[PDB]
């Protein structure tokens, strides 16, 4: 195991500009059609969300570039990707990404999500491996390419999987998934959404009410994270790995004040940020 890989390429991380994205319900209150303001962490509008390239193809001949570096967790991360083929599986938030400190690990494994908090011993380039098992006659998904050993684990949550796809429309959908993670005072909160889309590449213009998925009573100290890819074995086709092509958008939260507008149904709509410009 621990088959290192990366090459070197990377060029300048393509930047972009999300217009108005990442407005999560900043509480568990049901509300009517009012106007609500809130000081919290948010992604400021018209920010410079970095556009990272995973497995990256180039017009010329095969060539796959690998570049999902570890990134700073700062105070919160807006994670989003399109990915019609489920090649993103989860994330490995932590402090040192070794033993002597704990680490959180979220894997998807599309029949059941499962989260552990062990003193893992991750490789320097973790990923899930997919192979064939020759008994059970079924392509299993052994995770031992991620970590060496997992001892002292102090948690284990199982649940219907997050990344539930649909498509079933031969295109025109592309199903943009978003996630926002924030970690305060010994908790860990995840917010999600699945949205149909029709734009070419980048972020659309509407509003997304990211409603919360879970909250995890952990207390772990987090300052650096990474993301998991599900590469499969190649076989009799002339290392033997590297499925598909993937990319995701990352951008960090900051403490700001917003003026959310509620529906009569109980859902948001347009969020106004005090801080953007003088008009706001």
């Amino acid at each position, epitope marked *: 195991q621990c088959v290192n890989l990366t090459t070197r390429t990377q060029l300048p991380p393509a930047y972009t500009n999300s217009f108005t994205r990442g407005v999560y319900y900043p509480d568990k209150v049901f509300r009517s059609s009012v106007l609500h303001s809130t000081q919290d962490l948010f992604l400021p509008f018209f920010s410079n969300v970095t556009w990272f390239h995973a497995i990256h193809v180039s017009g010329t001949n095969g060539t796959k570039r690998f570049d999902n570096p570890v990134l700073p967790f700062n105070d919160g991360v807006y994670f989003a990707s399109t990915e019609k083929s489920n090649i993103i599986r989860g994330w490995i938030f932590g402090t040192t990404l070794d033993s002597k400190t704990q680490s959180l690990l979220i894997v998807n494994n599309a029949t059941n999500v499962v989260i552990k908090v062990c003193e893992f011993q991750f490789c320097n380039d973790p990923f899930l491996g*997919v*192979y064939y098992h*020759k008994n059970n006659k079924s392509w299993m998904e052994s995770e031992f390419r991620v970590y060496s050993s997992a001892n002292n684990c102090t948690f284990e949550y199982v649940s219907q999987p997050f990344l539930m796809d649909l498509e079933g429309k031969q295109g025109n959908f592309k199903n943009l998934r978003e996630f926002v993670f924030k970690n305060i005072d010994g908790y860990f909160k995840i917010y999600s959404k699945h949205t149909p889309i029709n734009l070419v590449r980048d972020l659309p213009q509407g509003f997304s009410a990211l409603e919360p998925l879970v909250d995890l009573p952990i207390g772990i100290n987090i300052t650096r994270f990474q993301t998991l890819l599900a590469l499969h074995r190649s*076989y*009799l086709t*002339p290392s*033997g790995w590297t499925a598909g092509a993937a990319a995701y958008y990352v951008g960090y939260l900051q403490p700001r004040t917003f003026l959310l507008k509620y529906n009569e149904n109980g859902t948001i709509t347009d969020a106004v940020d005090c801080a953007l410009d003088p008009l706001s």
Partner: antibody
Amino acid sequence: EVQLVESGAEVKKPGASVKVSCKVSGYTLTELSMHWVRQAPGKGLEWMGGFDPEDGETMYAQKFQGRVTMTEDTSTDTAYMELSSLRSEDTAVYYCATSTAVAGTPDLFDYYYGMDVWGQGTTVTVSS
Amino acid sequence: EIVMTQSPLSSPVTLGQPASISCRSSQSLVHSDGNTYLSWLQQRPGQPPRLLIYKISNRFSGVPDRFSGSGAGTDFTLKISRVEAEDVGVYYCTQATQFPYTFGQGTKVDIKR
């Protein structure tokens, strides 16, 4: 991309049993199908053992049936083959041949048969 | 069970010229789902047999592309073109259908001295 490791020589005495081992490396033992092939010296190649990607069972050469067994330690990535009641005409090099059980991606399934990588042989010898 | 054969049981070829090994059968080797299973093992003296053109007409990884498979059904043929050194050994033609496999009657080649 695969490497097979043999198990050294073994001189024996007629009537005993002998077990030959083969360590894979590069892939894992739970996605290859092992076949054992003798080389009676100065002669051709002879098949025994093997594995059917179908039915998962492990066929046994009629010539050596009720006389050989084959087991798999999937933890240390070695396969074992136990020939018993060795007659005088079993001095041979014993090859550990393998392939990959299927072919392709998680989308396309071809149960693939044959031998692809051949692992360097051990040399048993019966002698009274 | 199958039980094919060979053709030249030798054929000390010349330098720089092509060569032809001819396999044969005693069944129809078209396995169900229609893909027949041949392979053309090359064994040096004192070494394990490596592999060459498996599955009728293909090529294995690292085979230096002088080798060519042909045939169908019951006749088969390997053909090297413009041979040189480092191609001297025995060329078995294993089948891979009907469980109890079986190998070719063997066929050695060498230099045409």
